[PDB]
Symmetry: C2
Subunit: 118 residues, 2 copies
């Protein structure tokens, strides 16, 4: 009776235009979805046919994305920290979003439950 | 020497909040990515390791998404027309975005090249 979800944490301090931010969120969702597909197949499958729920939250620094990624790693959650070579309006290698999940909602919330909604 | 990309067409007439629109764009990207993975594996693989380029464009009606989906189908392009049962702020079954690709840029552009950027 587990519910599954993916939470994408987007940086709101990069002054990115909406189309670019949406693209970054999509990079995170796709990348983490494939991470789950290959190493947590059951979680991926359940999520994918139960609405593939996604919630977009935000942070105001690059540092918070790294700390959240570390927490996701420590809990064994599929995740993807995104950088985009094509996003030249920000410095090369700058991370834009962190996608966490798909995974059981209660586990994902341990990492992202207190983040604020975009 | 083919370049690959995925274009996600989002409806800008639904008055959706940014977090929800980004989530819908992500649904499209993930769904179409898996469509390509299963029926155009080569296109998916190239795209996925070459930056998985995504561009977000918009339309102002549900009707345009259907016409674009038909065009994508006629050109044999992986695509995903999205509806979200959890998006209750709009009528049930309402389509929100159409993701086209990954596929060679020149083919994708035949469908989305004249759409305006979000
Ligand atoms: Na660019
Ligand atoms: Na909802």
């Amino acid at each position: 009776m587990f519910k599954y979800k993916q939470v994408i944490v987007a940086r709101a301090d990069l002054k990115l235009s909406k189309g670019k931010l949406a693209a970054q969120v999509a990079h995170g969702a796709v990348t983490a979805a494939f991470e789950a597909y290959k190493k947590k197949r059951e979680w991926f499958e359940a999520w994918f046919r139960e609405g593939q729920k996604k919630v977009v939250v935000k942070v105001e620094s690059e540092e918070e994305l790294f700390k959240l990624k570390a927490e996701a790693e420590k809990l064994g959650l599929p995740n993807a920290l995104i950088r985009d070579a094509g996003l030249t309006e920000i410095p090369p290698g700058t991370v834009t979003v962190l996608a966490v999940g798909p995974a059981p909602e209660e586990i994902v919330d341990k990492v992202t439950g207190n983040l604020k909604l975009l």
